Write a structure and sequence with these properties.
part of a larger assembly, 6 chains, C: little secondary structure, about 0% helix, F: mainly beta, N-terminal domain of TfIIb, 2 domains, four-stranded antiparallel β-sheet, three-stranded antiparallel β-sheet, 7 strands, zinc ion binding (chain F), nucleus (chain F), metal-binding (chain F)
Chain lengths: ~60, ~90, ~35, ~80, ~50, ~120
């Protein structure tokens, strides 16, 4: 029963924790990040920051 | 509100009249002008970011267990009204 | 004289190559490969 | 494609490694800098990473163009009237 | 164009009098902007220089 | 575990048949007159999910593959410290990352998972 109850759970998307960006909704700096080379290589990398305290999302490029 | 006016702003009679007149004047100039072609404006507004959307579509590609359609293919399926989603 | 050999992209599946020659003996960061 | 450098060969990533290797330096990790210099293998992996974005731009230009044309043709005849409708 | 993907166009030409000079009387044959270095990370341009 | 049985006459596989007056099972060849007596009521088997332990696969002359790594672990049988090691060679999606070691001298197979 315990093993089944553990196996009925979904994938937990735990994101990298950092304390530099400031959220615009709750202003709690516990905002996760993800950065990649997605925009055209004529321009630098693109970062996307998501607040894990309120659900805010934004982009910096 | 009355308490906000008397305690937070401390406006006089002259400033209050000025604020009311300015608010009415700035509101009356915000209505939309008849004759504007809003359809092409809306289409351009929606479809300009769609061009740049391709770059960052595959950020969800960074999560293998989150293989859910979003981005260009999802917008394509929404527009086509597809009867068989991925 | 059997000093060099021509390798295609299929035989390469069954070989081992030391990239620098000095990597065969027992700035940047160069790691000593365990092979 | 959102994952580390997969096994292109059988049970490795490059002829200079050993079978069943999972170390970071063997799966596309660059611990150097542009001021220091890149070693050949991480140079190759960086090249693949760049190739992905190059392809992205080169094709999705055309796909987005088609979508944009269809959108503008669909909505081109909508106008605010004097009834405000 | 330079050998590192940095190309441009001539926007104006100056004569040797309006050119900034060093204490030794040397004058730059051309002048480029530094706002092109960071986002491109062409450190090889600087090293080649 | 059902096993195919071939007729002794023409090598064809034997089909089952019943004997009502004696109520006994027989194997007959549809091409000839050979009939043989069934030794068990187990003729066919259809499993669904395979609870098979992961296998190292072919082992013969595996020590001459130069792209296979090495280790200094000690043999549990011949007390040698040189061997080859590799992951499971069966390509199921959900296979764990449990190693397999083949000794250089005695060609003994063991695993890094010493579960009692």
């Amino acid at each position: 029963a315990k093993q089944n109850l553990y196996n009925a759970q979904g994938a937990t998307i735990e994101r990298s924790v950092t304390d530099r960006f400031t959220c615009g909704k709750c202003k709690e700096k516990k905002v996760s990040y993800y950065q990649l080379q997605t925009r055209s290589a004529d321009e630098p990398l693109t970062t996307f920051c998501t607040c894990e305290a309120c659900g805010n999302r934004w982009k910096f490029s | 509100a009355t308490r906000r006016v008397l305690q937070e702003y401390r406006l006089t009679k002259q400033a209050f009249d000025w604020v009311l007149s300015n608010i009415e004047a700035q509101f009356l100039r915000s209505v939309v002008h008849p004759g504007e072609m809003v359809g092409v404006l809306a289409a351009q507004s929606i479809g300009e970011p769609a061009t740049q959307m391709t770059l960052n579509t595959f950020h969800f590609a960074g999560v293998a267990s989150k293989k859910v359609t979003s981005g260009v293919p999802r917008l394509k399926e929404i527009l086509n009204v597809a009867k068989n989603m991925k | 004289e059997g000093l060099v050999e021509y390798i295609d992209a299929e035989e390469e599946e069954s070989i081992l190559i030391a990239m620098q020659p000095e990597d065969l003996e027992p700035k940047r960061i160069r790691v000593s490969h365990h092979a | 494609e959102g994952k580390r450098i997969a096994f292109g060969f059988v049970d490795r990533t490059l002829p200079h490694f050993s079978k069943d290797d999972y170390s970071p330096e063997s799966k596309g990790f660059v611990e150097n800098s542009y001021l220091r210099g890149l070693t050949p293998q991480e140079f190759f992996f960086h090249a693949m990473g760049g190739r992905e974005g190059l392809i992205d731009t080169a094709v999705k230009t055309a796909e987005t163009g088609y979508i944009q044309r269809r959108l503008v043709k669909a909505l081109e005849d909508i106008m605010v009237h004097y009834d405000n409708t | 164009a330079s050998r590192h993907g940095q190309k441009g166009t001539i926007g104006i030409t100056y004569r040797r009098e309006d050119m900034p000079f060093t204490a030794e009387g040397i004058v730059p044959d051309l002048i480029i902007n530094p706002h092109a270095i960071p986002s491109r990370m062409t450190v090889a341009h600087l090293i080649e220089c | 575990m059902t096993t195919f049985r071939f007729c002794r006459d023409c090598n064809n596989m034997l089909y089952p048949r019943e004997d009502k007056e004696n109520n006994r099972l027989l194997f007959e060849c549809r091409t000839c007159s050979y009939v043989e007596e069934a030794g068990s009521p187990l003729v066919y088997r259809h499993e669904l999910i395979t609870n098979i332990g992961e296998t190292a696969g072919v082992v013969q002359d595996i020590g001459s593959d130069p792209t296979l790594p090495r280790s200094d672990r000690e043999c549990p049988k011949c007390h040698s410290r040189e061997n080859v090691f590799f992951q499971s060679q069966q390509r199921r999606k959900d296979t764990s990352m449990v190693l397999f070691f083949v000794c250089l001298s005695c060609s003994h197979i063991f695993t890094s998972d010493q579960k009692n």
